[PDB]
Design a protein around this ligand. Structure first.
Ligand code: SF4
Ligand SMILES: [Mg+2]
Ligand SMILES: [Mg+2]
Ligand SMILES: [Mg+2]
Ligand SMILES: [Mg+2]
Ligand SMILES: [Mg+2]
Ligand SMILES: [Mg+2]
Ligand SMILES: [Mg+2]
Ligand SMILES: [Mg+2]
Ligand SMILES: [Mg+2]
Ligand SMILES: [Mg+2]
Ligand SMILES: [Mg+2]
Ligand SMILES: [Mg+2]
Ligand SMILES: [Mg+2]
Ligand SMILES: [Mg+2]
Ligand SMILES: [Mg+2]
Ligand SMILES: [Mg+2]
Ligand SMILES: [Mg+2]
Ligand SMILES: [Mg+2]
Ligand SMILES: [Mg+2]
Ligand SMILES: [Mg+2]
Ligand SMILES: [Mg+2]
Ligand SMILES: [Mg+2]
Ligand SMILES: [Mg+2]
Ligand SMILES: [Mg+2]
Ligand SMILES: [Mg+2]
Ligand SMILES: [Mg+2]
Ligand SMILES: [Mg+2]
Ligand SMILES: [Mg+2]
Ligand SMILES: [Mg+2]
Ligand SMILES: [Mg+2]
Ligand SMILES: [Mg+2]
Ligand SMILES: [Mg+2]
Ligand SMILES: [Mg+2]
Ligand SMILES: [Mg+2]
Ligand SMILES: [Mg+2]
Ligand SMILES: [Mg+2]
Ligand SMILES: [Mg+2]
Ligand SMILES: [Mg+2]
Ligand SMILES: [Mg+2]
Ligand SMILES: [Mg+2]
Ligand SMILES: [Mg+2]
Ligand SMILES: [Mg+2]
Ligand SMILES: [Mg+2]
Ligand SMILES: [Mg+2]
Ligand SMILES: [Mg+2]
Ligand SMILES: [Mg+2]
Ligand SMILES: [Mg+2]
Ligand SMILES: [Mg+2]
Ligand SMILES: [Mg+2]
Ligand SMILES: [Mg+2]
Ligand SMILES: [Mg+2]
Ligand SMILES: [Mg+2]
Ligand SMILES: [Mg+2]
Ligand SMILES: [Mg+2]
Ligand SMILES: [Mg+2]
Ligand SMILES: [Mg+2]
Ligand SMILES: [Mg+2]
Ligand SMILES: [Mg+2]
Ligand SMILES: [Mg+2]
Ligand SMILES: [Mg+2]
Ligand SMILES: [Mg+2]
Ligand SMILES: [Mg+2]
Ligand SMILES: [Mg+2]
Ligand SMILES: [Mg+2]
Ligand SMILES: [Mg+2]
Ligand SMILES: [Mg+2]
Ligand SMILES: [Mg+2]
Ligand SMILES: [Mg+2]
Ligand SMILES: [Mg+2]
Ligand SMILES: [Mg+2]
Ligand SMILES: [Mg+2]
Ligand SMILES: [Mg+2]
Ligand SMILES: [Mg+2]
Ligand SMILES: [Mg+2]
Ligand SMILES: [Mg+2]
Ligand SMILES: [Mg+2]
Ligand SMILES: [Mg+2]
Ligand SMILES: [Mg+2]
Ligand SMILES: [Mg+2]
Ligand SMILES: [Mg+2]
Ligand SMILES: [Mg+2]
Ligand SMILES: [Mg+2]
Ligand SMILES: [Mg+2]
Ligand SMILES: [Mg+2]
Ligand SMILES: [Mg+2]
Ligand SMILES: [Mg+2]
Ligand SMILES: [Mg+2]
Ligand SMILES: [Mg+2]
Ligand SMILES: [Mg+2]
Ligand SMILES: [Mg+2]
Ligand SMILES: [Mg+2]
Ligand SMILES: [Mg+2]
Ligand SMILES: [Mg+2]
Ligand SMILES: [Mg+2]
Ligand SMILES: [Mg+2]
Ligand SMILES: [Mg+2]
Ligand SMILES: [Mg+2]
Ligand SMILES: [Mg+2]
Ligand SMILES: [Mg+2]
Ligand SMILES: [Mg+2]
Ligand SMILES: [Mg+2]
Lengths: 96, 82, 57, 208, 276
RNA sequence: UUGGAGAGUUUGAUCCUGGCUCAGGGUGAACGCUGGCGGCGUGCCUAAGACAUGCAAGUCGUGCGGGCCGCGGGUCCGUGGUCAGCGGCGGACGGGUGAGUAACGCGUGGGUGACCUACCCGGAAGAGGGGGACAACCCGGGGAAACUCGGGCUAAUCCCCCAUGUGGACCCGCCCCUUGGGGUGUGUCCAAAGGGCUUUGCCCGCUUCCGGAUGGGCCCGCGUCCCAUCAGCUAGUUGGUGGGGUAAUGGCCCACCAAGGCGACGACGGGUAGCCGGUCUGAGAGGAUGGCCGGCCACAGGGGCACUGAGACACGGGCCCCACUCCUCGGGAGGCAGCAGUUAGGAAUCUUCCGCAAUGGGCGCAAGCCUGACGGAGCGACGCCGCUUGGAGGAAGAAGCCCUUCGGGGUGUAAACUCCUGAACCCGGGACGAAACCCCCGACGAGGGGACUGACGGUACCGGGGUAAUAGCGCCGGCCAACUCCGUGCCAGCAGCCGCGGUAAUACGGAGGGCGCGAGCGUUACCCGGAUUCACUGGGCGUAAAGGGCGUGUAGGCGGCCUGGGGCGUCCCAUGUGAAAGACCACGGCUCAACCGUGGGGGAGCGUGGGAUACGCUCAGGCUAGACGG
RNA sequence: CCGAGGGUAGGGCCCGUGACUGGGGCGGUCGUAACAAGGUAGCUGUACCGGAAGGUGCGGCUGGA
């Protein structure tokens, strides 16, 4: 029967909403890139993971990711897309 | 942030503070970093203020903040007088 | 129950301190006079404390 | 607080004259001069040999009674002497000699230590100028046990001063008469006094 | 025991009311009290620790006259009843003034057959009992007015009391009443605590069967004195001559003890019981 | 070298052994009888049972757009109140409690090339353009309530896209470095926000980076209670490779593979407990303990969960289950182990008080606002310390009472009386605790100057005036200080142990007298003490309790003479750590003291570095006196 | 997928309680086993027996002759 504690709560519903949203696309896109490196599909993969890379740091701009997380998120995305492409090269365009 | 504050000791009706550096958020008479002077604001003796001005200048330089009525006593026995 | 005469009986509310009586084996506790329905002792002048008796005038 | 009540009886219990009263003490109207025997129904009775306990009991009693002090403060003092550096039996005697209500006595401002207390308590006495009304004050060497100069106009203080013109005070005291003030020069030495207290005994007593 | 009255409450037909005080003559409910049971006397912290007359009347109705027989083994029977009168508070081991003797009061024919059974067979005591148990009282039926003189202006050594009271019948079961309306001072301030005792002993022996007189009102309204010959034991003998005489005046009546009785019987003997 | 007392009790007597019992100190105490003043502490130990009501976290109009009351008048406009709303920071601190936990929880010392840190302090770089949503508000349904819902409008320091790239982030390579540490190169990736005054300019904000400071996470050695009538335990168990998760390591989580891991140096299991600084006891060694203050953990009715966030799995935030209890038939509300307070339980534990003056905290440029933290007041002899109930005089000595050999003896200078002081009260004055934030000059800095602000409290204290002004409790056989009469007659009763009482009781009850303490004295409960009666200091086993019935041997303990190496134990020096409070010694502060300040002195124990080499260890060589053998 | 907890079924340890029963400690009846060579030396492990102590056998001990 009191407080602007509830104001803090309404404020968290929208907050979690944007994080969830951001974090979603990230996974989706990253997986999608990696899926394309699993066939390769050279040009397409990077194209995505590029857009993926973007969404990673950009999320970490706000209160969504840590820089280290965005750092890990970026690390493996790259390690996986690349190692995957080692089966059939042609790594053009650019992320290497 | 970190601070220069008045930790109270002494008795009831016997304020004997300890101008001290601590984290903003301790209990007032709680565990600080360093003591840098005393201050019997009742002046029941000669030296009721004692600031190790050397140290009071260090903490200020690293980043410490001071109670508005701590500089009242840091200034009084001059820490800032260039 | 210590002293001369007492007012205690079935259903008396009572208070007990420890300390046994040598000769009364099994009895291992003492009733404290002047508390609850335990009377102090009438006509007791010496050691009134140990017998829950108020001072005369 | 302090005892109060029949005090001839103390001395005659103690087998020894203590100077607890005042003027009468020296007179042959002292009951001890007449009845040098323990008070109560069994006084003139062929006493039974003391116990080492009795012996150290009585020696302690007299020593406290002499100064008219609570059993607790006496003991309090005594333990502190034991903590303090050097001889305990002496430092004790010294420490309880440094007590303001007793200093006022040696300095003769009054007759009994009993009478003395009341002076200090009432404010009639002071130390180093400033008035001091507690019979427990540690008179620390270098001090001015004046009369409250604003209570010099009185029939009793002059009177006991009247009677103190030239008696030699303590070797540790400096009664400048007329000016109504003394000085605590240095805390007493052991031999510096001879009351009927075998101080070694009060020690063995509290060590039971 | 100290106790701390926190809030103070009043009760209406529909709501509770907090009040900041309760003045004398009035009443209400007090929160905060802990170990205070009913029938108790709360005073203020700095006030006369008197106890109000709450929780009253004992009260015995059968007297058996036990004589200590013989004769120096007396004070052991007095040491028996003493422990008894701590084991059981109801009964009074009262002493009779004129005849001088001890009297075991009680609560029924039986209360003395369990006491003076144990009193002989659980101690020893060389003593014996009769006795009836005649336990009536006395009172007055109409108000009358006399004088309580003690006109002995002789000897020079004391002996003068003069007393005037209006003695009226009280509601039964009520007991004693004493209102003190002395006007002017015609009897000094120090002859009240001993004209009341002058009355309070006069009712001890009655005018017909000679039993305690209760249920009266004694209004002390007048009386003279002689400052030289007036003694405190001259108004104390004055009020004994007026009270033991005004009770003889306006119709002195033997009041008598009565018992509510729960008899348990089989249905067969009911009528045999009842009609008896 | 400031430190160490013992006694009663087994016998007819003794010596020894040996148990029991007692005098001591201590307490968050409590019970009896008694109780005057003040100071400082301190007070639910039990049901972490249930709780009525009031309060305990909010703030910024110098982020943004709005709805009424006013205010100078031309239904206009500017402003400042005001309730919200959006947005920011706080709400994770501060306060409570010890249920759970035998644990990396705590202590103590270290590791992190395995990481975090809002606000605060430096240093480097910047703020270019563009778009967009949601509340508010207008409108439209339900409820006897919480309130919700669809449509449209809209501001920003809300939101997003392009840009710039000091810089940072990832992949691969390369140089250094050695667990993921620094630098470089090519590809890719990522910044942003405006408000205000006195207005070519200062101020408070934002942006990406590196460093500091402080607060953390994680890890490791060593230390932490009882039961072995708990002896065997373990399948995410133990390791591996891969991956998910995090700020980060890790079986933390998942897939697979390997068969491990722990255990008499006590695993597993059961009991019990929050740990430490300290505290109490003790000659010490040791034992006991963790209330209050400080430090860390843990919990927020019982549970689980995650959101938001620098930070929580969040006491007075959200969701779900349960139990209980409350608001009217759909659905709701609650969470005092915050401050008070109620109730229950109990032998027992407080005011529903005052104040934000101080100190500290949150927000704010500031003025200021909130602060049951805190500063104080109330109650409780709970504890310690300070004081009072008077002081000098007064008879070979009243009365009353007690004893007596009948002469006396005692209470007893005690009292009555004599003077003298003068707690309480009465009058007057009356505080430090408070100089800063703020205004001015300087420059919003240094420095100088001035003003407002005190709950305690008209209280302390000072000045004058001034009344003889509470005493109570334990004990008086022995330990143990204090002795007589009467009553009682193995009765009634006492009692810690020996024991006392059966008609002459220093032991029971009263009296007188005495002893002992004194606003206290006794009692019960519990701890250490005495108890060298768990014995390391510091005991024992022929007969007192106690040598295994006897061998063999496993682990373990211990082990000759000489010389070399090492330096693990052991010894020494230096150095870091051993917070504050306490303890100690000195000095000071409140009239003393309790209490309280400043200063000093440090130890043990662990980390690092140096040294010594006798003894113990270890390695090598040698011997023959132990042992075995011919 | 996991998951508070609910349910079902089977086990382990603890506590309390139970007709009745076994001794155990504290305050008349039968004998007389022990203490003196205790009137059969005593004790002892074991075995069988007996109202009860206890007796007897076998072997042992001396704390016995
Ligand atoms: S000495 Fe004389 S005066 Fe002093 S006390 Fe003894 S008897 Fe009384
Ligand atoms: Mg999806
Ligand atoms: Mg972030
Ligand atoms: Mg987050
Ligand atoms: Mg990793
Ligand atoms: Mg009853
Ligand atoms: Mg009752
Ligand atoms: Mg005066
Ligand atoms: Mg001692
Ligand atoms: Mg001793
Ligand atoms: Mg005996
Ligand atoms: Mg024997
Ligand atoms: Mg004997
Ligand atoms: Mg012994
Ligand atoms: Mg004693
Ligand atoms: Mg001792
Ligand atoms: Mg509790
Ligand atoms: Mg406790
Ligand atoms: Mg409520
Ligand atoms: Mg607002
Ligand atoms: Mg706990
Ligand atoms: Mg366990
Ligand atoms: Mg551990
Ligand atoms: Mg550790
Ligand atoms: Mg934040
Ligand atoms: Mg960009
Ligand atoms: Mg792994
Ligand atoms: Mg891995
Ligand atoms: Mg595991
Ligand atoms: Mg697996
Ligand atoms: Mg396998
Ligand atoms: Mg348990
Ligand atoms: Mg526990
Ligand atoms: Mg010892
Ligand atoms: Mg604590
Ligand atoms: Mg929990
Ligand atoms: Mg609760
Ligand atoms: Mg919970
Ligand atoms: Mg819950
Ligand atoms: Mg926050
Ligand atoms: Mg937590
Ligand atoms: Mg929660
Ligand atoms: Mg709460
Ligand atoms: Mg919260
Ligand atoms: Mg509470
Ligand atoms: Mg309460
Ligand atoms: Mg109760
Ligand atoms: Mg309090
Ligand atoms: Mg404040
Ligand atoms: Mg403030
Ligand atoms: Mg408040
Ligand atoms: Mg007090
Ligand atoms: Mg009490
Ligand atoms: Mg005589
Ligand atoms: Mg006489
Ligand atoms: Mg005589
Ligand atoms: Mg006198
Ligand atoms: Mg001031
Ligand atoms: Mg200016
Ligand atoms: Mg005044
Ligand atoms: Mg005060
Ligand atoms: Mg005065
Ligand atoms: Mg007097
Ligand atoms: Mg005693
Ligand atoms: Mg004796
Ligand atoms: Mg009798
Ligand atoms: Mg007794
Ligand atoms: Mg006899
Ligand atoms: Mg007798
Ligand atoms: Mg006795
Ligand atoms: Mg006696
Ligand atoms: Mg005291
Ligand atoms: Mg003990
Ligand atoms: Mg020991
Ligand atoms: Mg033992
Ligand atoms: Mg023992
Ligand atoms: Mg030994
Ligand atoms: Mg032994
Ligand atoms: Mg045994
Ligand atoms: Mg043996
Ligand atoms: Mg053998
Ligand atoms: Mg071996
Ligand atoms: Mg070896
Ligand atoms: Mg060797
Ligand atoms: Mg070494
Ligand atoms: Mg320290
Ligand atoms: Mg001082
Ligand atoms: Mg210090
Ligand atoms: Mg060799
Ligand atoms: Mg399950
Ligand atoms: Mg289950
Ligand atoms: Mg369920
Ligand atoms: Mg069973
Ligand atoms: Mg025989
Ligand atoms: Mg035989
Ligand atoms: Mg035989
Ligand atoms: Mg024989
Ligand atoms: Mg046989
Ligand atoms: Mg038979
Ligand atoms: Mg046979
Ligand atoms: Mg044989
Ligand atoms: Mg034997």
């Amino acid at each position: 029967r009191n407080l602007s504690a509830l104001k803090r709560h309404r404020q968290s519903l929208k907050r979690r909403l944007r994080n969830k949203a951001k974090k979603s696309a990230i996974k989706t896109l990253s997986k999608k890139a990696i899926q394309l490196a699993q066939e390769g599909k050279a040009e397409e993969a990077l194209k995505i993971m590029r857009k993926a890379e973007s969404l990673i740091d950009k999320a970490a701009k706000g209160s969504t990711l840590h820089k280290n997380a965005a750092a890990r998120r970026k690390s493996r995305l790259m390690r996986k897309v690349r190692q995957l492409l080692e089966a059939a090269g042609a790594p053009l365009i650019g992320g290497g | 942030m970190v601070k220069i504050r008045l930790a109270r000791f002494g008795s009831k009706h016997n304020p004997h503070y300890r101008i001290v550096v601590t984290d903003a958020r301790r209990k007032r008479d709680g565990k600080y970093i360093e003591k840098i002077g005393y201050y019997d604001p009742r002046k029941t003796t000669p030296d009721w203020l004692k600031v190790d001005v050397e140290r009071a200048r260090y903490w200020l330089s690293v980043g410490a903040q001071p109670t508005d009525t701590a500089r009242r006593l840091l200034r009084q026995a001059g820490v800032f007088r260039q | 129950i210590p002293g001369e005469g007492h007012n205690l009986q079935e259903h008396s509310v009572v208070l007990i301190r420890g300390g046994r009586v040598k000769d009364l084996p099994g009895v291992r506790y003492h009733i404290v006079r002047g508390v609850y329905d335990a009377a102090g002792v009438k006509d007791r002048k010496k050691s009134r404390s140990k017998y829950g008796t108020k001072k005369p005038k | 607080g302090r005892y109060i009540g029949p005090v001839c009886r103390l001395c005659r219990r103690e087998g020894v004259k203590l100077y607890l009263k005042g003027e009468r003490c020296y007179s042959p109207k002292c009951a001890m001069e007449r009845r040098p025997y323990p008070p109560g129904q069994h006084g003139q009775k062929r006493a039974r040999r003391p116990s080492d306990y009795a012996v150290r009991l009585r020696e302690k009693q007299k020593l406290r009674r002499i100064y008219g002090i609570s059993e607790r403060q006496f003991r309090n003092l005594f333990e502190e002497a034991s903590k303090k550096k050097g001889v305990t039996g002496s430092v004790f005697l010294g420490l309880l000699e440094s007590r303001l209500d007793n200093v006022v006595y040696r300095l003769g401002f009054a007759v009994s230590r009993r009478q003395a207390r009341q002076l200090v308590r009432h404010g009639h006495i002071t130390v180093n100028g400033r008035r001091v009304d507690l019979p427990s004050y540690r008179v620390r060497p270098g001090d001015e046990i004046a009369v409250a100069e604003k209570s010099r106009n009185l029939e009793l203080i002059r009177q006991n001063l009247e009677a103190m013109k030239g008696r030699k005070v303590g070797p540790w005291l400096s009664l400048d008469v007329e000016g109504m003030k003394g000085k605590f020069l240095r805390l007493p030495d052991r031999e510096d006094l001879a009351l009927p207290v075998n101080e070694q005994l009060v020690i063995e007593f509290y060590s039971r | 025991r100290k106790e701390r009255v926190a809030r103070l409450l009043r009760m209406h037909a529909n709501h509770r009311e907090e009040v900041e005080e309760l003045k004398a003559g009035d009443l209400g409910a007090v929160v905060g009290l802990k170990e205070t049971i009913t029938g108790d006397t709360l005073v203020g912290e700095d006030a006369p620790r008197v106890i109000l007359e709450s929780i009253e009347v004992p009260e015995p109705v059968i007297d058996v006259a036990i004589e200590p027989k013989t004769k120096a083994d007396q004070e052991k029977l007095s040491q028996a009843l003493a422990r008894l009168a701590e084991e059981d508070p109801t009964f009074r081991v009262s002493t009779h003034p004129e005849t001088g003797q001890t009297i075991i009061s009680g609560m029924g024919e039986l209360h003395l057959e369990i006491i003076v059974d144990r009193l002989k067979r659980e101690f020893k005591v060389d003593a014996n009992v009769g006795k009836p148990q005649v336990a009536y009282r006395e009172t007055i039926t109409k108000p009358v007015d006399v004088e309580g003189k003690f006109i002995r202006q002789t000897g020079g050594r004391g002996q003068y009391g003069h007393v005037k009271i209006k003695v009226e019948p009280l509601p039964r079961g009520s007991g004693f009443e004493f209102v003190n309306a002395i006007v002017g001072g015609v009897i000094p301030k120090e002859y009240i605590p001993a004209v009341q005792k002058g009355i309070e002993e006069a009712m001890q022996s009655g005018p017909l069967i000679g039993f305690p007189v209760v249920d009266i009102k004694v209004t002390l309204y007048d009386g003279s004195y002689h400052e030289v010959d007036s003694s405190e034991m001259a108004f104390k003998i004055a009020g004994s001559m007026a009270i033991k005489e005004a009770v003889q005046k306006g119709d002195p009546v033997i009041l008598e003890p009565i018992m509510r009785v729960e008899v348990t019987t089989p249905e067969e003997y009911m009528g045999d019981v009842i009609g008896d």
